[model samples]
Target: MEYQLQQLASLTLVGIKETYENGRQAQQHIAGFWQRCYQEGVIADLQLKNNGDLAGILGLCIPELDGKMSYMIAVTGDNSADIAKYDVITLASSKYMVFEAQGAVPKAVQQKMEEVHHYIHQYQANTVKSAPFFELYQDGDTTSEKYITEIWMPVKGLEHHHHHH
Candidate 1:
């Protein structure tokens, strides 16, 4: 897998939240959340800019759950916006194992994410901190064949900490 190590700054997202037992369930919820957001003009109403030049939505995950995990389907933006109806998620800065997902939509992204998570465990680097890992959609069009996205998994460690395999 092609990957890079990077430090991500904190992010503030305004969107809807959902809980599910697994990724498949999460996808089911996500599909409707996005549709509602678009139909209700929630996305346009936010009037917030996407972090970096990468414009699109974000899907963040918190794996710590009793039986079902919680996820936030959001867009990175200003905190002052009138997003009262939506949940506010604050992602703290942390070291990340970054992986790129391209070509297709959910299928490619999901496959790459599984691979990355498996690799992280194989390397014994699952020392995540108090926040959730995230997926940043670089290309706005998920239906496009050339869409691109970045999967960021937060890992606990400093720049000096090295993994020796």
Candidate 2:
């Protein structure tokens, strides 16, 4: 339940976007999408930089997906190639409730997410619906026994203040 309130910079991701009725549907397709991307040489062909030592995958719930609750399966990095080839998502600078999840895949992640929702509702952490929430997979592995996922939720209640002269 530990979290940090911080500002996140924008990121460019290349991948696919799919609609899901719930987390199960999102979980079912997101993994397959990434697997296909890997098998199809999309990751290798990208030649991206500043990926933070591991190729990270994201599950983003954004409003632009038409409000039916969709998830974007993507890898984050720099892009200079044809944007048309992939669905490009830009995560704007915003304050986030950054936290971590450990244990099992989908289950633990989902539990953590549920806990976040309850906490957010109880604490009134959710400020806007315009921003997105994400679960960032480390090393692109969600099935490992020691898997670790970073959860980021954009909220307005907790903000990071900068001091200047």
Candidate 3:
């Protein structure tokens, strides 16, 4: 229930992407994907190429059956790094229902995502179907209970867009 409607510009993300059969398969692979990115030092390298700063680390979802999504570790700065090694995803500008993840990494964020999806199910007519639903990470230590993660669910419009608010 605690959310803000926000308008964001089109984003071009750069990082790794993989395929999964469904939501169930992605959980196993995505958990591993993040761990590999973090533990293998690939994520740090991406940050460096990203101007040593990032908007957020995103887990971008496009989970159709046997579909593709991204471990959107970089929001791609104007750096001159050769991006041939990274995957790119471009999203159209849209409004989003932004919600904070409570508790800790993966577990808390995971459940929060479920809650968000369920809540948004009733509003599907007003949500963006082609766009991705992503979780944005800002803190360093995600295992800690105080870590912050935000879920961005794309929406078509809000009351303010219609006026009389």
Off by over 4 Å in 1: 22-24, 47-55, 158-165
The lDDT values for all models are 0.71, 0.68, 0.73
Candidate 3 C-alpha lDDT tens digits along 1-165: 688887777766677777676667778888888888889887886676553233666778875533654344555554336766787766678888999986768899978888887887767567877778888787478888888898988887555343325
Model 1, 1-165: lDDT tens digits are 788888867767777677788767877887686678779886666536454422567777776557566777777776464566677867777777788888677788878878886777755545473468878876467787778788887776434355533
User: Top TM-score: which candidate number?
Assistant: 3
Clashes of 1: 0
Best by lDDT: 3
lDDT by residue (tens digit), candidate 2, 1-165 = 688776777777766676766656666776786677679876555434335522466768766545455677666665456555677777787778787788778788878888887776644534557787888876646687578888888876453322111
Per-model TM against the reference: 0.78, 0.73, 0.83
Write down the RMSD of all candidates, one decimal each. 3.0, 4.8, 3.0
lDDT of 1 at 84: 62
Two-way lDDT contest, 2 vs 3, winner: 3
What local lDDT score does residue 150 receive in model 2, on the 0 to 100 scale? 82
Ranking by lDDT: 3, 1, 2
Off by over 4 Å in 3: 51-54, 63-72, 160-165
Question: Where does candidate 2 stray beyond 4 Å?
Answer: 21-50, 53-55, 82-84, 159-165
TM-score of 3: 0.83
